[PDB]
Every structure is written in structure tokens, then in C-alpha cells.
């Protein structure tokens, strides 16, 4: 996270760290959506051009964390993967369309003050919240700069941007399964996600029922916190029918 701030304790209790077993390192962000299911970006698990293709046994998820590198005894919970599910129409060849994947844990995770699921939006909460100008919140243990690493979870709030402005900031083909967020240069404030934040959540707190909803997944960007560029996010609601399908089935 570039130009954000330290998170408060328990601020993002749905935050998950995707951790590689050997070599032990941070893969990506992810989110807790129930006691056995974690949501992340497909690209965190599968990106053949870079010969990335993780299987279940390559990874751990760490839940309940704040410090990036510490083992947080009596606080974090570490879970093993039963099965990975990637969107079958995930477009890794072109633009990361449908950049979404689910991970089912081998055993349910115990909720706690530090461990708690986020909500997924329904149609109305997305129509109501996913508006240009409305701010969401991004969290992660990713890089502090485009070109070090934080000691604790970082947080930043960013406004959703107008689709034509998103489209005009990049040569990449944008789809309806994506949105972009970030400040414009004339706005002065700032912030962005960055390497290592990939797969983490973009959340909004509904002013109607005071619950946090995950509207986005950190998907891609061109650099980090560059003027005139914006972070891109997987549109969770848009892909909700696939999420529903997997969980109902499995």
C-alpha cells in the first residue's frame, strides 16, 4: 500500500495473507467470506506467462494478522487449503478479466476479535455504493513504494473513478468485471495498492446497515501511485453468480 497508514488492531478482521510455504513469503492478500472460504485474485494463483501455477499444498493462509512478518501467537490462525477454484473464464492471456478465485479451507476457522468475515454485496448494495466519488478501503502488506515493506497491515481509502476516466488512463482493454479507484492528480491526495497487495479486498461500509461489504479485489495497475494512473479492481458483485455456484456446489 503506497501513501496509506498503519491499520488499527481489528480494523480489517477479514484480511487474509496468502503465504508461500517454501520459500516462506507473502504471495498476496485475500479475504475471509465464511469460516471455510477465502476470496482472492485468480492471478495470485495462476499466471502462466510467469510460470505461476500454485497448487493447494504450496500455500498457507494466515488469518487474524496485523504484523507482516511476526508469528502472532494466540492471535493469528494458519489454515491449510483443501481446494482452489479459479474462474474458468479468467483471462490471463489478455487483461485479467474475471480476476477471481476461491479457496476452501481444510477445517473451519474460529472467529475472534481479530478474525471475522466480510459481507458480499447484492445487486442493490452494489448499485447504491459503486458510484464515482464514493470511497472504499484497501488493505495489505504489499510494498510501500513502486520502486520498502511495512511492519504492520497498511490501510488506504480511495474514491471510485468514472469509467471513461479509467478507460482513458490506460491502453489496456477494460471490462464490466472491473472498476478503478484512486485520486486524480488535481485532487492532491494520494494512495494505491502495490506489489503484495494483489488479491486483497476493497471494502465499503454501507451507510444503510453499517456493515462492510467487499466490492472489489486488488487486481492490477501500471506501476503504483503514479500520477494519472489508477488501481484496478475485480468487480465482486458482477462475479457473484460464479461465487454462489462454487459454494453451493462444493
Amino acid at each position: 500500500i503506497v501513501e496509506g497508514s498503519d491499520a488499527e488492531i481489528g480494523m480489517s478482521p477479514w484480511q487474509v495473507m496468502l503465504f508461500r510455504k517454501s520459500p516462506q513469503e507473502l504471495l498476496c492478500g485475500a479475504s475471509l467470506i465464511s469460516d471455510r472460504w477465502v476470496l482472492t485474485a485468480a492471478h495470485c494463483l495462476l499466471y502462466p506467462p510467469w510460470d505461476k501455477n500454485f497448487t493447494e499444498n504450496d500455500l498457507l493462509v494466515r488469518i487474524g494478522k496485523h504484523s507482516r512478518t511476526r508469528y502472532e501467537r494466540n492471535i493469528e490462525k494458519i489454515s491449510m487449503l483443501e481446494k482452489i477454484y479459479i474462474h474458468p473464464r479468467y483471462n490471463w492471456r489478455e487483461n485479467l478479466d474475471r480476476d477471481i478465485a476461491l479457496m476452501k479451507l481444510k477445517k473451519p476457522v474460529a472467529f475472534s476479535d481479530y478474525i471475522h468475515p466480510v459481507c458480499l454485496p447484492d445487486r442493490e448494495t452494489a448499485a447504491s455504493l459503486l458510484q464515482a466519488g464514493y470511497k472504499g478501503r484497501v488493505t495489505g502488506w504489499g510494498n510501500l513504494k513502486e520502486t520498502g515493506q511495512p511492519s504492520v497491515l497498511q490501510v488506504v481509502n480511495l474514491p471510485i473513478v468514472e469509467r471513461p476516466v479509467c478507460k482513458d488512463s490506460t491502453r489496456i482493454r477494460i471490462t464490466d468485471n472491473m472498476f478503478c479507484a484512486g485520486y486524480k492528480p488535481d485532487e492532491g491526495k494520494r494512495g494505491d495498492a502495490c506489489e503484495g497487495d494483489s488479491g486483497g479486498p476493497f471494502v465499503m461500509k454501507s451507510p444503510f446497515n453499517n456493515r462492510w461489504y467487499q466490492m472489489g479485489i486488488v487486481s492490477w495497475g501500471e506501476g503504483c501511485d503514479r500520477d494519472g494512473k489508477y488501481g484496478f479492481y475485480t468487480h465482486v458483485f458482477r462475479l457473484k453468480k460464479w461465487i454462489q455456484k462454487v459454494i453451493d456446489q462444493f
Binding site: K21, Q24, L60, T69, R70, Y71, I78, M80
Partner: peptide, 10 residues
């Protein structure tokens, strides 16, 4: 660099 995690989780 990461703190080692308990053996159990591998």
C-alpha cells in the same frame, strides 16, 4: 524476513 511458524502447519 519471516518469523518461522510452528512445525504443525509446516
Amino acid at each position: 524476513d519471516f518469523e518461522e511458524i510452528p512445525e504443525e502447519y509446516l
